[PDB]
Amino acid sequence: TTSRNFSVGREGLEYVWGNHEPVRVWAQESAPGDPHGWPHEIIIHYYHRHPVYTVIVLCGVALAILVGTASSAACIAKARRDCLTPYALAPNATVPTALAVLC
Amino acid sequence: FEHATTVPNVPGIPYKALVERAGYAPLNLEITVVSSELTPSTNKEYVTCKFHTVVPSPQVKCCGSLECKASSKADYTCRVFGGVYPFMWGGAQCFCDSENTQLSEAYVEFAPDCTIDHAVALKVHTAALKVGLRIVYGNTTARLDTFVNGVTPGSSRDLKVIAGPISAAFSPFDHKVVIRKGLVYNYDFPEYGAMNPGAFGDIQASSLDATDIVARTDIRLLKPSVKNIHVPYTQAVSGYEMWKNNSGRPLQETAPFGCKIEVEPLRATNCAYGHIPISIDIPDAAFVRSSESPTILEVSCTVADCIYSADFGGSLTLQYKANREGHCPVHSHSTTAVLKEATTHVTATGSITLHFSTSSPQANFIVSLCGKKTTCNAECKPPADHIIGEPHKVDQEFQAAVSKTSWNWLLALFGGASSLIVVGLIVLVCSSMLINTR
Numbered sequence: 123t124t125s126r127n128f129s130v131g132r133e134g135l136e137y138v139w140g141n142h143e144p145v146r147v148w149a150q151e152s153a154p155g156d157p158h159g160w161p162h163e164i165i166i167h168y169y170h171r172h173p174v175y176t177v178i179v180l181c182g183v184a185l186a187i188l189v190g191t192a193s194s195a196a197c198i199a200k201a202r203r204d205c206l207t208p209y210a211l212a213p214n215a216t217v218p219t220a221l222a223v224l225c
Numbered sequence: 226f227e228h229a230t231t232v233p234n235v236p237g238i239p240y241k242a243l244v245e246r247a248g249y250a251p252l253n254l255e256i257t258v259v260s261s262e263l264t265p266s267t268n269k270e271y272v273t274c275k276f277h278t279v280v281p282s283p284q285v286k287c288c289g290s291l292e293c294k295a296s297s298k299a300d301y302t303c304r305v306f307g308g309v310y311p312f313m314w315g316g317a318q319c320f321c322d323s324e325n326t327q328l329s330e331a332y333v334e335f336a337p338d339c340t341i342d343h344a345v346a347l348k349v350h351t352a353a354l355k356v357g358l359r360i361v362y363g364n365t366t367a368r369l370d371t372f373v374n375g376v377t378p379g380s381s382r383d384l385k386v387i388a389g390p391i392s393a394a395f396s397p398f399d400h401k402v403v404i405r406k407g408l409v410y411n412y413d414f415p416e417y418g419a420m421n422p423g424a425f426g427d428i429q430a431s432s433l434d435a436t437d438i439v440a441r442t443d444i445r446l447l448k449p450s451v452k453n454i455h456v457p458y459t460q461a462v463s464g465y466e467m468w469k470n471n472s473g474r475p476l477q478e479t480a481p482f483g484c485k486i487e488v489e490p491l492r493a494t495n496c497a498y499g500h501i502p503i504s505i506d507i508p509d510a511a512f513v514r515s516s517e518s519p520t521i522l523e524v525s526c527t528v529a530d531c532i533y534s535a536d537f538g539g540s541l542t543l544q545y546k547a548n549r550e551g552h553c554p555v556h557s558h559s560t561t562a563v564l565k566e567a568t569t570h571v572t573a574t575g576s577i578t579l580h581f582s583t584s585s586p587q588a589n590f591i592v593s594l595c596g597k598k599t600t601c602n603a604e605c606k607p608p609a610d611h612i613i614g615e616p617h618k619v620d621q622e623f624q625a626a627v628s629k630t631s632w633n634w635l636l637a638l639f640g641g642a643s644s645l646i647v648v649g650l651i652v653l654v655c656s657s658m659l660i661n662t663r
Protein backbone atom coordinates (compact mmCIF):
# COMPACT_ATOMS: atom_id res chain seq x y z
CA THR A 123 0.00 0.00 0.00
CA THR A 124 1.06 3.59 -0.58
CA SER A 125 -0.19 7.02 -1.69
CA ARG A 126 -0.19 8.13 -5.32
CA ASN A 127 -0.77 11.50 -6.97
CA PHE A 128 -2.56 11.89 -10.30
CA SER A 129 -3.00 15.08 -12.33
CA VAL A 130 -6.57 14.63 -13.52
CA GLY A 131 -7.26 15.81 -17.03
CA ARG A 132 -9.54 18.80 -17.37
CA GLU A 133 -12.15 16.95 -19.43
CA GLY A 134 -12.02 13.70 -17.47
CA LEU A 135 -10.05 10.69 -16.29
CA GLU A 136 -10.52 6.93 -15.97
CA TYR A 137 -10.14 4.87 -12.80
CA VAL A 138 -9.36 1.16 -13.25
CA TRP A 139 -8.55 -0.75 -10.06
CA GLY A 140 -9.52 -4.19 -8.83
CA ASN A 141 -11.64 -6.64 -10.81
CA HIS A 142 -14.72 -4.50 -10.15
CA GLU A 143 -16.01 -2.05 -12.73
CA PRO A 144 -14.08 1.23 -13.08
CA VAL A 145 -15.29 4.77 -12.39
CA ARG A 146 -14.84 8.03 -14.29
CA VAL A 147 -14.06 11.31 -12.51
CA TRP A 148 -13.69 14.77 -14.06
CA ALA A 149 -12.34 18.13 -12.88
CA GLN A 150 -13.52 21.73 -12.63
CA GLU A 151 -12.31 25.07 -11.24
CA SER A 152 -12.40 26.45 -7.70
CA ALA A 153 -10.05 29.46 -7.71
CA PRO A 154 -11.36 32.85 -6.45
CA GLY A 155 -12.32 34.44 -9.75
CA ASP A 156 -15.12 36.93 -9.21
CA PRO A 157 -14.32 40.11 -7.21
CA HIS A 158 -16.28 41.39 -4.20
CA GLY A 159 -16.75 45.05 -5.16
CA TRP A 160 -13.26 46.04 -3.96
CA PRO A 161 -9.81 45.82 -5.58
CA HIS A 162 -8.70 42.20 -5.85
CA GLU A 163 -5.93 40.03 -7.29
CA ILE A 164 -8.23 38.44 -9.84
CA ILE A 165 -5.43 37.40 -12.20
CA ILE A 166 -4.36 34.64 -9.80
CA HIS A 167 -7.59 32.78 -10.55
CA TYR A 168 -6.94 33.05 -14.29
CA TYR A 169 -3.36 32.04 -13.52
CA HIS A 170 -4.52 28.76 -11.96
CA ARG A 171 -6.57 27.87 -15.06
CA HIS A 172 -5.14 28.20 -18.56
CA PRO A 173 -1.61 29.40 -17.69
CA VAL A 174 -1.47 30.36 -21.37
CA TYR A 175 -3.69 33.24 -22.57
CA THR A 176 -3.54 34.76 -19.05
CA VAL A 177 -0.08 36.39 -19.05
CA ILE A 178 -0.25 37.51 -22.68
CA VAL A 179 -3.05 39.92 -21.73
CA LEU A 180 -0.79 41.63 -19.20
CA CYS A 181 2.04 41.95 -21.73
CA GLY A 182 -0.33 43.35 -24.35
CA VAL A 183 -1.79 45.87 -21.91
CA ALA A 184 1.68 46.96 -20.82
CA LEU A 185 2.81 47.36 -24.43
CA ALA A 186 -0.31 49.33 -25.35
CA ILE A 187 -0.06 51.69 -22.38
CA LEU A 188 3.69 52.19 -22.89
CA VAL A 189 3.20 52.96 -26.58
CA GLY A 190 0.38 55.38 -25.79
CA THR A 191 2.39 57.16 -23.11
CA ALA A 192 5.48 57.41 -25.33
CA SER A 193 3.45 58.74 -28.25
CA SER A 194 1.72 61.28 -26.01
CA ALA A 195 5.03 62.43 -24.52
CA ALA A 196 6.68 62.79 -27.92
CA CYS A 197 3.68 64.60 -29.39
CA ILE A 198 3.36 67.01 -26.47
CA ALA A 199 7.10 67.72 -26.51
CA LYS A 200 7.06 68.41 -30.25
CA ALA A 201 3.91 70.53 -29.95
CA ARG A 202 5.52 72.50 -27.13
CA ARG A 203 8.66 73.11 -29.19
CA ASP A 204 6.49 74.12 -32.15
CA CYS A 205 4.47 76.29 -29.78
CA LEU A 206 7.93 77.72 -29.13
CA THR A 207 8.04 78.41 -32.85
CA PRO A 208 7.43 81.97 -31.52
CA TYR A 209 11.20 82.18 -31.22
CA ALA A 210 10.28 85.81 -31.54
CA LEU A 211 12.90 87.31 -29.22
CA ALA A 212 11.94 90.87 -30.19
CA PRO A 213 8.22 90.83 -29.25
CA ASN A 214 7.08 89.95 -25.74
CA ALA A 215 5.26 86.68 -25.06
CA THR A 216 2.79 86.41 -27.94
CA VAL A 217 0.18 85.30 -25.39
CA PRO A 218 1.11 84.39 -21.78
CA THR A 219 -1.86 82.02 -21.91
CA ALA A 220 0.13 79.83 -24.31
CA LEU A 221 3.16 80.29 -22.05
CA ALA A 222 1.02 78.65 -19.36
CA VAL A 223 0.34 75.80 -21.79
CA LEU A 224 4.07 75.49 -22.44
CA CYS A 225 4.85 75.82 -18.73
CA PHE B 226 -42.09 20.18 -39.91
CA GLU B 227 -38.31 19.79 -40.27
CA HIS B 228 -35.72 21.34 -37.96
CA ALA B 229 -31.92 21.19 -38.05
CA THR B 230 -29.63 21.11 -35.02
CA THR B 231 -26.08 20.13 -34.05
CA VAL B 232 -25.43 17.94 -31.01
CA PRO B 233 -22.20 16.87 -29.27
CA ASN B 234 -21.14 13.23 -29.46
CA VAL B 235 -21.62 12.19 -25.84
CA PRO B 236 -23.99 9.96 -23.82
CA GLY B 237 -26.33 11.13 -21.09
CA ILE B 238 -26.32 14.73 -22.35
CA PRO B 239 -29.90 15.74 -23.25
CA TYR B 240 -30.11 18.71 -25.62
CA LYS B 241 -33.18 20.94 -25.72
CA ALA B 242 -34.46 22.97 -28.66
CA LEU B 243 -37.53 24.79 -29.95
CA VAL B 244 -39.32 25.08 -33.29
CA GLU B 245 -40.80 28.44 -34.33
CA ARG B 246 -43.96 28.38 -36.44
CA ALA B 247 -46.44 31.23 -36.79
CA GLY B 248 -49.63 30.53 -34.86
CA TYR B 249 -48.13 27.44 -33.19
CA ALA B 250 -46.81 27.43 -29.64
CA PRO B 251 -43.05 26.71 -29.59
CA LEU B 252 -42.66 22.96 -29.15
CA ASN B 253 -40.04 21.65 -26.74
CA LEU B 254 -37.77 19.05 -28.36
CA GLU B 255 -35.44 16.91 -26.24
CA ILE B 256 -32.75 14.84 -27.97
CA THR B 257 -30.62 12.22 -26.20
CA VAL B 258 -27.79 10.15 -27.67
CA VAL B 259 -28.31 6.96 -25.68
CA SER B 260 -25.04 5.37 -26.82
CA SER B 261 -22.55 5.09 -29.67
CA GLU B 262 -21.70 2.11 -31.88
CA LEU B 263 -18.60 2.38 -34.08
CA THR B 264 -18.51 -0.75 -36.25
CA PRO B 265 -15.74 -1.07 -38.87
CA SER B 266 -15.27 -3.46 -41.78
CA THR B 267 -12.66 -6.16 -41.22
CA ASN B 268 -11.35 -9.25 -43.00
CA LYS B 269 -9.93 -12.43 -41.50
CA GLU B 270 -6.27 -12.87 -42.46
CA TYR B 271 -5.04 -15.93 -40.54
CA VAL B 272 -4.72 -17.55 -37.11
CA THR B 273 -1.82 -18.38 -34.81
CA CYS B 274 -1.32 -20.32 -31.58
CA LYS B 275 1.21 -22.41 -29.70
CA PHE B 276 2.36 -25.32 -31.85
CA HIS B 277 3.85 -28.77 -31.25
CA THR B 278 6.72 -30.40 -33.11
CA VAL B 279 6.20 -33.82 -34.70
CA VAL B 280 8.71 -36.51 -33.77
CA PRO B 281 7.70 -39.54 -35.86
CA SER B 282 9.40 -42.90 -35.78
CA PRO B 283 12.65 -42.66 -37.77
CA GLN B 284 13.35 -44.83 -40.79
CA VAL B 285 16.22 -47.32 -40.51
CA LYS B 286 17.81 -49.00 -43.52
CA CYS B 287 20.19 -51.69 -42.34
CA CYS B 288 23.55 -52.19 -44.02
CA GLY B 289 22.29 -50.47 -47.18
CA SER B 290 21.34 -47.10 -48.63
CA LEU B 291 18.39 -44.68 -48.65
CA GLU B 292 17.52 -41.16 -49.80
CA CYS B 293 15.63 -38.26 -48.23
CA LYS B 294 12.17 -37.26 -49.44
CA ALA B 295 10.27 -34.07 -48.70
CA SER B 296 6.74 -33.90 -47.30
CA SER B 297 3.84 -31.51 -47.86
CA LYS B 298 3.53 -30.93 -44.10
CA ALA B 299 4.18 -27.35 -43.05
CA ASP B 300 7.68 -26.45 -41.85
CA TYR B 301 8.86 -29.95 -42.76
CA THR B 302 12.46 -31.08 -42.36
CA CYS B 303 14.27 -34.23 -43.47
CA ARG B 304 17.83 -35.54 -43.36
CA VAL B 305 19.77 -38.78 -43.68
CA PHE B 306 22.68 -40.00 -41.56
CA GLY B 307 25.08 -42.87 -42.19
CA GLY B 308 27.15 -44.83 -39.72
CA VAL B 309 24.23 -44.95 -37.29
CA TYR B 310 24.62 -46.60 -33.88
CA PRO B 311 21.19 -48.16 -33.24
CA PHE B 312 20.53 -49.63 -29.80
CA MET B 313 17.40 -50.29 -27.77
CA TRP B 314 16.25 -52.22 -24.72
CA GLY B 315 15.90 -55.15 -27.10
CA GLY B 316 19.42 -54.35 -28.28
CA ALA B 317 21.10 -53.64 -31.58
CA GLN B 318 18.04 -53.26 -33.77
CA CYS B 319 19.82 -54.68 -36.82
CA PHE B 320 23.34 -55.89 -37.57
CA CYS B 321 26.09 -54.78 -39.94
CA ASP B 322 29.56 -53.45 -39.19
CA SER B 323 28.48 -49.79 -38.98
CA GLU B 324 27.18 -49.95 -42.57
CA ASN B 325 23.59 -49.13 -41.63
CA THR B 326 22.02 -45.68 -41.97
CA GLN B 327 18.87 -43.91 -40.80
CA LEU B 328 16.60 -41.21 -42.20
CA SER B 329 15.00 -38.77 -39.77
CA GLU B 330 12.34 -36.13 -40.37
CA ALA B 331 9.95 -33.89 -38.48
CA TYR B 332 7.23 -31.27 -38.90
CA VAL B 333 4.87 -29.15 -36.80
CA GLU B 334 1.16 -28.99 -36.06
CA PHE B 335 -1.12 -26.89 -33.87
CA ALA B 336 -1.72 -28.42 -30.45
CA PRO B 337 -5.26 -29.38 -29.36
CA ASP B 338 -5.32 -26.55 -26.81
CA CYS B 339 -5.01 -24.19 -29.79
CA THR B 340 -8.67 -24.97 -30.51
CA ILE B 341 -9.49 -22.47 -27.76
CA ASP B 342 -6.17 -20.58 -27.50
CA HIS B 343 -6.37 -19.37 -31.10
CA ALA B 344 -5.46 -15.76 -31.90
CA VAL B 345 -6.74 -14.23 -35.14
CA ALA B 346 -5.00 -11.48 -37.10
CA LEU B 347 -7.50 -8.97 -38.52
CA LYS B 348 -7.25 -6.30 -41.20
CA VAL B 349 -9.77 -3.49 -40.70
CA HIS B 350 -10.93 -0.42 -42.62
CA THR B 351 -13.81 2.01 -43.17
CA ALA B 352 -14.99 2.59 -39.62
CA ALA B 353 -18.76 3.10 -39.52
CA LEU B 354 -20.67 4.70 -36.65
CA LYS B 355 -24.18 3.84 -35.43
CA VAL B 356 -26.08 6.26 -33.17
CA GLY B 357 -29.19 5.64 -31.10
CA LEU B 358 -31.34 8.72 -30.55
CA ARG B 359 -34.33 9.22 -28.26
CA ILE B 360 -36.49 12.27 -28.99
CA VAL B 361 -39.21 13.70 -26.74
CA TYR B 362 -41.77 16.09 -28.23
CA GLY B 363 -45.11 17.11 -26.76
CA ASN B 364 -44.53 14.77 -23.81
CA THR B 365 -44.32 11.92 -26.33
CA THR B 366 -41.18 9.79 -26.57
CA ALA B 367 -39.99 8.26 -29.85
CA ARG B 368 -36.80 6.38 -30.71
CA LEU B 369 -34.55 5.62 -33.64
CA ASP B 370 -31.21 3.99 -34.41
CA THR B 371 -29.40 5.21 -37.52
CA PHE B 372 -26.05 4.92 -39.24
CA VAL B 373 -24.06 8.12 -38.78
CA ASN B 374 -24.27 8.73 -42.54
CA GLY B 375 -26.47 11.60 -43.67
CA VAL B 376 -28.13 9.67 -46.50
CA THR B 377 -29.94 6.76 -44.77
CA PRO B 378 -32.77 7.92 -42.50
CA GLY B 379 -33.99 5.21 -40.14
CA SER B 380 -37.44 3.75 -39.58
CA SER B 381 -39.44 4.47 -36.42
CA ARG B 382 -43.20 4.95 -36.74
CA ASP B 383 -42.31 5.16 -40.45
CA LEU B 384 -40.50 8.42 -39.60
CA LYS B 385 -37.40 9.42 -41.56
CA VAL B 386 -34.70 10.97 -39.36
CA ILE B 387 -31.16 11.63 -40.58
CA ALA B 388 -27.94 12.42 -38.72
CA GLY B 389 -24.32 13.21 -39.50
CA PRO B 390 -21.90 13.05 -41.13
CA ILE B 391 -19.43 13.62 -38.28
CA SER B 392 -17.47 16.85 -38.05
CA ALA B 393 -14.28 14.78 -37.70
CA ALA B 394 -13.45 11.10 -38.14
CA PHE B 395 -12.17 9.19 -35.11
CA SER B 396 -11.27 5.50 -34.88
CA PRO B 397 -9.09 3.86 -32.20
CA PHE B 398 -8.62 0.84 -34.46
CA ASP B 399 -5.54 0.62 -36.69
CA HIS B 400 -5.12 -1.10 -40.04
CA LYS B 401 -3.64 -4.20 -38.38
CA VAL B 402 -5.05 -5.77 -35.20
CA VAL B 403 -5.15 -9.10 -33.37
CA ILE B 404 -7.83 -10.76 -31.23
CA ARG B 405 -7.03 -13.36 -28.56
CA LYS B 406 -9.24 -14.70 -25.76
CA GLY B 407 -11.53 -11.68 -25.97
CA LEU B 408 -8.65 -9.18 -25.84
CA VAL B 409 -7.85 -6.91 -28.79
CA TYR B 410 -4.24 -5.84 -29.36
CA ASN B 411 -2.99 -3.19 -31.78
CA TYR B 412 0.00 -4.61 -33.65
CA ASP B 413 1.37 -4.81 -37.20
CA PHE B 414 1.14 -8.56 -37.68
CA PRO B 415 3.37 -10.08 -40.38
CA GLU B 416 1.60 -10.61 -43.68
CA TYR B 417 0.32 -14.07 -44.57
CA GLY B 418 2.98 -16.29 -46.09
CA ALA B 419 5.78 -14.50 -44.20
CA MET B 420 7.48 -16.78 -41.67
CA ASN B 421 10.00 -15.26 -39.24
CA PRO B 422 11.19 -17.50 -36.38
CA GLY B 423 10.92 -16.00 -32.92
CA ALA B 424 8.13 -13.57 -33.83
CA PHE B 425 4.38 -13.14 -33.58
CA GLY B 426 2.34 -15.22 -36.00
CA ASP B 427 5.11 -17.74 -36.67
CA ILE B 428 2.47 -20.39 -37.43
CA GLN B 429 -0.20 -19.23 -39.89
CA ALA B 430 -3.31 -20.92 -41.25
CA SER B 431 -6.33 -19.86 -43.29
CA SER B 432 -8.65 -21.55 -40.77
CA LEU B 433 -8.28 -23.21 -37.39
CA ASP B 434 -8.92 -26.71 -38.79
CA ALA B 435 -7.20 -26.26 -42.16
CA THR B 436 -5.31 -29.32 -43.35
CA ASP B 437 -3.05 -27.10 -45.47
CA ILE B 438 -0.58 -25.07 -43.39
CA VAL B 439 2.55 -23.02 -44.02
CA ALA B 440 5.23 -22.23 -41.45
CA ARG B 441 8.98 -21.89 -40.93
CA THR B 442 10.63 -21.90 -37.50
CA ASP B 443 14.23 -22.95 -38.23
CA ILE B 444 14.28 -26.64 -37.35
CA ARG B 445 17.67 -28.35 -37.74
CA LEU B 446 18.26 -32.07 -37.28
CA LEU B 447 21.11 -33.36 -35.12
CA LYS B 448 23.16 -36.44 -35.93
CA PRO B 449 22.65 -39.52 -33.73
CA SER B 450 25.09 -39.25 -30.84
CA VAL B 451 24.20 -41.94 -28.26
CA LYS B 452 23.83 -45.69 -27.83
CA ASN B 453 20.09 -45.91 -28.43
CA ILE B 454 17.92 -44.78 -31.33
CA HIS B 455 17.09 -41.11 -30.79
CA VAL B 456 16.29 -38.04 -32.88
CA PRO B 457 17.71 -34.85 -31.34
CA TYR B 458 15.86 -31.81 -32.70
CA THR B 459 16.81 -28.17 -32.17
CA GLN B 460 14.30 -25.37 -32.74
CA ALA B 461 13.69 -21.79 -31.67
CA VAL B 462 11.18 -20.97 -28.95
CA SER B 463 7.57 -20.66 -30.08
CA GLY B 464 6.66 -17.11 -31.05
CA TYR B 465 3.14 -17.27 -29.61
CA GLU B 466 4.32 -17.48 -26.01
CA MET B 467 6.95 -14.88 -26.92
CA TRP B 468 4.36 -12.32 -27.99
CA LYS B 469 2.28 -13.34 -24.96
CA ASN B 470 5.06 -12.57 -22.48
CA ASN B 471 5.64 -8.98 -23.68
CA SER B 472 2.50 -8.26 -25.69
CA GLY B 473 2.14 -4.89 -23.98
CA ARG B 474 -0.97 -3.51 -22.36
CA PRO B 475 -4.37 -4.12 -24.00
CA LEU B 476 -6.21 -1.56 -26.08
CA GLN B 477 -8.83 -1.29 -23.33
CA GLU B 478 -6.27 0.76 -21.38
CA THR B 479 -5.22 2.90 -24.37
CA ALA B 480 -8.38 3.82 -26.31
CA PRO B 481 -8.94 7.60 -26.41
CA PHE B 482 -12.26 8.87 -25.06
CA GLY B 483 -12.74 5.63 -23.12
CA CYS B 484 -14.15 3.59 -25.99
CA LYS B 485 -15.86 0.45 -24.67
CA ILE B 486 -14.66 -2.24 -27.08
CA GLU B 487 -16.55 -5.51 -27.63
CA VAL B 488 -15.06 -8.47 -29.45
CA GLU B 489 -17.84 -10.47 -31.11
CA PRO B 490 -18.53 -7.55 -33.51
CA LEU B 491 -15.00 -6.22 -33.03
CA ARG B 492 -16.59 -2.81 -32.51
CA ALA B 493 -16.49 0.12 -30.11
CA THR B 494 -19.43 1.55 -28.18
CA ASN B 495 -20.20 4.26 -25.63
CA CYS B 496 -17.30 6.35 -26.96
CA ALA B 497 -17.76 10.12 -27.15
CA TYR B 498 -16.05 12.56 -29.51
CA GLY B 499 -17.07 15.06 -32.18
CA HIS B 500 -20.23 16.86 -33.27
CA ILE B 501 -23.20 15.58 -35.27
CA PRO B 502 -25.63 17.65 -37.38
CA ILE B 503 -29.14 16.21 -37.56
CA SER B 504 -32.50 17.01 -39.14
CA ILE B 505 -35.68 15.99 -37.31
CA ASP B 506 -39.07 15.81 -39.03
CA ILE B 507 -42.12 16.20 -36.79
CA PRO B 508 -45.75 15.66 -37.89
CA ASP B 509 -47.86 18.80 -38.12
CA ALA B 510 -50.58 17.21 -35.99
CA ALA B 511 -48.12 17.09 -33.09
CA PHE B 512 -48.05 20.90 -33.10
CA VAL B 513 -50.65 22.88 -31.16
CA ARG B 514 -52.12 26.20 -32.25
CA SER B 515 -51.38 29.23 -30.09
CA SER B 516 -55.14 29.87 -29.81
CA GLU B 517 -55.57 27.05 -27.28
CA SER B 518 -52.16 27.63 -25.68
CA PRO B 519 -52.18 29.36 -22.28
CA THR B 520 -51.69 33.13 -22.40
CA ILE B 521 -49.15 34.72 -20.06
CA LEU B 522 -48.65 38.34 -19.07
CA GLU B 523 -46.10 40.50 -17.25
CA VAL B 524 -43.51 37.83 -16.45
CA SER B 525 -40.26 38.52 -14.60
CA CYS B 526 -37.15 36.62 -13.53
CA THR B 527 -35.14 36.43 -10.32
CA VAL B 528 -31.87 34.60 -9.63
CA ALA B 529 -32.29 33.56 -6.00
CA ASP B 530 -28.74 32.16 -5.98
CA CYS B 531 -26.36 30.56 -8.46
CA ILE B 532 -23.09 28.64 -8.19
CA TYR B 533 -20.49 28.20 -10.92
CA SER B 534 -20.75 24.43 -10.48
CA ALA B 535 -19.66 21.79 -12.97
CA ASP B 536 -22.81 19.82 -12.15
CA PHE B 537 -26.40 21.09 -12.43
CA GLY B 538 -26.63 23.31 -9.36
CA GLY B 539 -28.02 26.60 -10.64
CA SER B 540 -31.41 27.82 -9.46
CA LEU B 541 -33.82 30.42 -10.82
CA THR B 542 -37.34 31.71 -10.25
CA LEU B 543 -40.01 33.33 -12.41
CA GLN B 544 -43.22 35.18 -11.56
CA TYR B 545 -45.98 35.44 -14.15
CA LYS B 546 -49.47 36.82 -14.71
CA ALA B 547 -51.88 34.86 -16.90
CA ASN B 548 -55.54 34.32 -17.74
CA ARG B 549 -55.76 30.64 -18.78
CA GLU B 550 -54.94 27.39 -16.98
CA GLY B 551 -52.81 24.69 -18.56
CA HIS B 552 -49.18 23.95 -19.38
CA CYS B 553 -46.50 25.93 -21.17
CA PRO B 554 -42.90 25.11 -22.11
CA VAL B 555 -39.82 26.93 -20.85
CA HIS B 556 -36.58 27.42 -22.75
CA SER B 557 -33.28 29.31 -22.80
CA HIS B 558 -32.00 30.50 -26.18
CA SER B 559 -28.59 31.24 -24.62
CA THR B 560 -26.32 28.25 -25.24
CA THR B 561 -24.17 29.02 -22.19
CA ALA B 562 -27.02 27.86 -19.93
CA VAL B 563 -29.25 24.78 -20.05
CA LEU B 564 -32.50 24.18 -18.16
CA LYS B 565 -33.71 20.92 -16.56
CA GLU B 566 -37.49 20.74 -17.14
CA ALA B 567 -39.10 21.86 -20.39
CA THR B 568 -42.70 22.61 -19.40
CA THR B 569 -44.81 23.37 -16.34
CA HIS B 570 -48.29 24.34 -15.22
CA VAL B 571 -49.52 27.93 -15.50
CA THR B 572 -51.84 29.80 -13.12
CA ALA B 573 -53.36 33.28 -13.19
CA THR B 574 -50.64 34.85 -11.02
CA GLY B 575 -48.40 31.95 -10.04
CA SER B 576 -44.63 31.89 -9.67
CA ILE B 577 -42.41 28.84 -10.13
CA THR B 578 -38.75 27.93 -9.68
CA LEU B 579 -36.38 26.24 -12.11
CA HIS B 580 -33.16 24.22 -12.02
CA PHE B 581 -30.44 24.83 -14.59
CA SER B 582 -26.70 24.82 -15.25
CA THR B 583 -24.21 27.15 -16.91
CA SER B 584 -20.66 27.10 -18.26
CA SER B 585 -19.80 30.71 -17.32
CA PRO B 586 -19.85 32.65 -14.03
CA GLN B 587 -21.58 35.64 -15.66
CA ALA B 588 -25.14 34.29 -15.44
CA ASN B 589 -26.68 36.81 -17.82
CA PHE B 590 -29.02 35.54 -20.52
CA ILE B 591 -32.53 35.42 -22.01
CA VAL B 592 -35.09 32.76 -21.10
CA SER B 593 -38.58 32.25 -22.49
CA LEU B 594 -41.59 31.27 -20.41
CA CYS B 595 -44.31 29.75 -22.60
CA GLY B 596 -44.04 31.94 -25.73
CA LYS B 597 -42.77 35.13 -24.13
CA LYS B 598 -39.11 36.05 -23.55
CA THR B 599 -37.38 37.80 -20.66
CA THR B 600 -33.86 38.89 -19.76
CA CYS B 601 -32.32 37.73 -16.49
CA ASN B 602 -28.87 38.33 -14.99
CA ALA B 603 -26.75 37.31 -12.00
CA GLU B 604 -23.25 36.23 -10.97
CA CYS B 605 -22.13 32.77 -9.87
CA LYS B 606 -19.34 31.55 -7.60
CA PRO B 607 -16.94 28.59 -7.93
CA PRO B 608 -17.81 25.56 -5.79
CA ALA B 609 -15.97 24.10 -2.82
CA ASP B 610 -15.84 20.64 -4.42
CA HIS B 611 -13.82 20.67 -7.64
CA ILE B 612 -13.63 17.02 -8.76
CA ILE B 613 -16.73 15.24 -10.09
CA GLY B 614 -17.35 12.76 -12.89
CA GLU B 615 -21.02 13.53 -13.50
CA PRO B 616 -22.06 15.34 -16.72
CA HIS B 617 -20.09 18.57 -17.04
CA LYS B 618 -19.87 21.35 -19.62
CA VAL B 619 -23.21 20.69 -21.26
CA ASP B 620 -22.03 23.71 -23.26
CA GLN B 621 -18.31 24.21 -23.81
CA GLU B 622 -16.70 27.44 -22.67
CA PHE B 623 -16.86 30.32 -25.16
CA GLN B 624 -14.23 32.62 -23.62
CA ALA B 625 -17.11 34.06 -21.57
CA ALA B 626 -15.46 33.40 -18.20
CA VAL B 627 -14.44 37.07 -18.34
CA SER B 628 -16.54 39.02 -15.83
CA LYS B 629 -18.54 42.22 -16.20
CA THR B 630 -16.26 43.83 -13.62
CA SER B 631 -13.30 42.67 -15.72
CA TRP B 632 -14.84 44.38 -18.77
CA ASN B 633 -15.37 47.57 -16.78
CA TRP B 634 -11.76 47.52 -15.54
CA LEU B 635 -10.38 46.78 -19.02
CA LEU B 636 -12.45 49.60 -20.51
CA ALA B 637 -11.20 51.98 -17.80
CA LEU B 638 -7.64 50.79 -18.49
CA PHE B 639 -7.36 51.49 -22.22
CA GLY B 640 -6.87 55.20 -22.83
CA GLY B 641 -7.79 57.49 -25.68
CA ALA B 642 -4.30 58.60 -26.67
CA SER B 643 -5.44 58.79 -30.30
CA SER B 644 -7.67 61.76 -29.49
CA LEU B 645 -4.80 63.37 -27.58
CA ILE B 646 -2.43 63.09 -30.55
CA VAL B 647 -5.12 64.32 -32.96
CA VAL B 648 -5.80 67.38 -30.81
CA GLY B 649 -2.07 67.99 -30.45
CA LEU B 650 -1.59 67.90 -34.21
CA ILE B 651 -4.57 70.22 -34.77
CA VAL B 652 -3.29 72.80 -32.29
CA LEU B 653 0.20 72.37 -33.76
CA VAL B 654 -0.95 73.25 -37.28
CA CYS B 655 -3.00 76.16 -35.93
CA SER B 656 0.06 77.53 -34.11
CA SER B 657 2.21 76.97 -37.20
CA MET B 658 -0.19 79.10 -39.23
CA LEU B 659 -0.35 81.74 -36.49
CA ILE B 660 3.44 82.00 -36.60
CA ASN B 661 3.56 81.99 -40.39
CA THR B 662 1.61 85.20 -39.85
CA ARG B 663 4.69 86.69 -38.14
Ligand SMILES: *[C@@H]1O[C@H](CO)[C@@H](O)[C@H](O)[C@H]1NC(C)=O
Binds near residue numbers: 363364551552
Ligand atom coordinates in the same frame (compact mmCIF):
# COMPACT_ATOMS: atom_id res chain seq x y z
C1 LIG C 1 -48.72 16.99 -23.02
O1 LIG C 1 -48.86 18.38 -22.72
C2 LIG C 1 -50.12 18.94 -23.10
C3 LIG C 1 -50.05 20.42 -22.81
O2 LIG C 1 -50.94 20.78 -21.75
C4 LIG C 1 -51.25 18.24 -22.35
O3 LIG C 1 -52.50 18.76 -22.78
C5 LIG C 1 -51.19 16.74 -22.61
O4 LIG C 1 -52.16 16.07 -21.82
C6 LIG C 1 -49.80 16.19 -22.28
N1 LIG C 1 -49.72 14.78 -22.60
C7 LIG C 1 -49.48 13.83 -21.68
C8 LIG C 1 -49.43 12.42 -22.19
O5 LIG C 1 -49.30 14.10 -20.50
